[PDB]
Amino acid sequence: FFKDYQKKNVMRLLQDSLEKIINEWLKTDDESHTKLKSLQELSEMDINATSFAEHSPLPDFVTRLWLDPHKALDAMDKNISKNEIRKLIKETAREIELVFTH
Amino acid sequence: EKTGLHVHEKIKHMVKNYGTMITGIPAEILGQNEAEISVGYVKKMGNMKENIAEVVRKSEMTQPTNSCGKASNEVCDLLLGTEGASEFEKSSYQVLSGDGSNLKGSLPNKNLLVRVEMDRFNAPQKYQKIKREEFNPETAEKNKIYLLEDQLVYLDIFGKVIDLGQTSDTCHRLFNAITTPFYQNYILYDEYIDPEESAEEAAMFEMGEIVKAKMKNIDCWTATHSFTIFVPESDSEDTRTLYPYQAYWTSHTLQQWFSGDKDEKLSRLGIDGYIEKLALLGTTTDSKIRSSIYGELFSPPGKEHVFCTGMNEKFSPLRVKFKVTEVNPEIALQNLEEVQEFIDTNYPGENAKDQCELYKIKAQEAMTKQLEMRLL
């Protein structure tokens, strides 16, 4: 039980961190909506593609957390697979993009 | 024994003593996360090492969450296990009837946990008169009435445009009637407006009548508070008491709830009495009654008379949604045991406070480290 409970709560903390960082980086977008189009691109990027993150409009935290999560947060539990992290980043990006197409 | 009352005492004892440690989040990954979201806050001028330490100390990471839902999610997970709490969360709510009878009936004498959602009827209170070629529903302030030249729309809180069923000719007349700049962007229900004063004010009263009438069949309620109620099995019908658990967004933590014995205070109301007040919250039309009871039930301990006063008066109508499921005390107590074991194993101390100080120190040292990696 505890490892599931602990893991769920750590994911939501990483999801909390990604929400705050992206929402503040997105508050300063230009009238061409450049950051929103890029955020849209992350939501659909393949779970195995590691090249779009070559320096992009996205904030430092996201690019690094995607490419190698256990280096960007080297206290993160081994029982959180890298793909779980990448899927979380994609899901987070999708949820904020949908808010700002309406 | 493994009585359901022991489940209550264990979760209260543990959230009181350990606070945010109940999440099970390891201190190190806590500080690395809080470093990432704080990079921008660190001064770039001077003795960065002191500037890092300043942000680490001003950091409220080891304070427990004060979020209505997050606390309730936490109580469900511990009391029902990780998948029992998903089944309970996915199932349907139920609106508290006017007399609360439907909740009273949902409480057989067993170890039961109730989850409650407080909804507010957040209906629009303001309006703007705007020309069509200047109205953009994605840019405009949500939850507002908009009077275009030929249409009267409601832009709801989700960005949806709802037409209010007016003819072009009714709208053109109201659009051309409201000429005063003070009233171009105003409120919908100014009780001091006298329509007989001018055509303009007459148009304002009319529009107010249209929007009030149409807003009744537009049931956009909004979730405003979340809490749980543990109702342990009791020896007899009268010994039966309930214990509400809550945090309040931006106001207080569940740890502070237990530090003030507010569960115990509210538990002393009885079940009939608690359901009476919870129900009156949803039937009353007196805002002083509504505000006073919301304070009693939901204020931080010791603020029952300051919670909903002045600008915090509860003017919007409220409703209560609930759902009830059974608690397995042996399962809850072992879930609680496993959190206790993890706290002891990784943050040991002679007393609970020393365990809490060791956690915070571990998290600040992770934070200090992660911030130095980004400002190397």
Author numbering:
A (entry chain A): 11 to 112
B (entry chain B): 7 to 382
Could you give the paper's own sentences about this structure?
Strikingly, the SidE- and MavC-type enzymes, two recently identified effector families from the bacterial pathogen Legionella pneumophila, can ubiquitinate host substrates through non-canonical mechanisms without engaging any of the conventional ubiquitination machinery. The genomic cluster of MavC encodes three effector proteins: Lpg2147 (MavC itself), Lpg2148 (MavC paralog A, or MvcA), and Lpg2149. Taken together, our data show that MavC can catalyze deamidation, ubiquitination, and deubiquitination by using the same active pocket. In addition to MavC and MvcA, the same genomic cluster in L. pneumophila also encodes a small effector protein, Lpg2149, which has been shown to interact with both enzymes and inhibit their deamidation activities.
The inhibitory role of Lpg2149 in the MavC system is reminiscent of the function of SidJ in the SidE system, although their operation mechanisms are distinct from each other. To understand the detailed molecular mechanisms of Lpg2149-mediated inhibition, we determined the crystal structures of MavC–Lpg2149 and MvcA–Lpg2149 complexes (X-ray statistics in Table 1). The asymmetric unit contains one Lpg2149 and one enzyme for both structures, highlighting a 1:1 molar ratio of the complex formation. Both structures adopt a similar assembly, with the Lpg2149 monomer binding to the connecting region between Catalytic and HBD domains. Lpg2149 forms similar and extensive hydrogen bonding and hydrophobic interactions with MavC and MvcA, which are mainly mediated by the N-terminal α-helix (aa 11–37) and a helix-loop motif (aa 74–86) of Lpg2149. Structural superimposition of MavC in Ub- and Lpg2149-bound states shows that Lpg2149 and Ub occupy a similar binding position and form severe steric clashes with each other, indicating that Lpg2149 can interfere with the interactions between Ub and MavC/MvcA. Upon binding to the enzymes, this C-terminal α-helix folds back and occupies the groove of the very same Lpg2149 molecule. The Catalytic–HBD dual domain of MavC adopts a similar conformation with or without Lpg2149. Given that MavC has the pre-formed Lpg2149 binding surface, we anticipated that MavC may have a stronger binding affinity to Lpg2149 than MvcA. Isothermal titration calorimetry (ITC) experiments confirm that the binding of Lpg2149–MavC (~0.57 nM) is ~50-fold stronger than that of Lpg2149–MvcA (~28.08 nM). Further SEC experiments show that the V20D/L23D/L24D mutant cannot form a stable complex with MavC like WT Lpg2149.
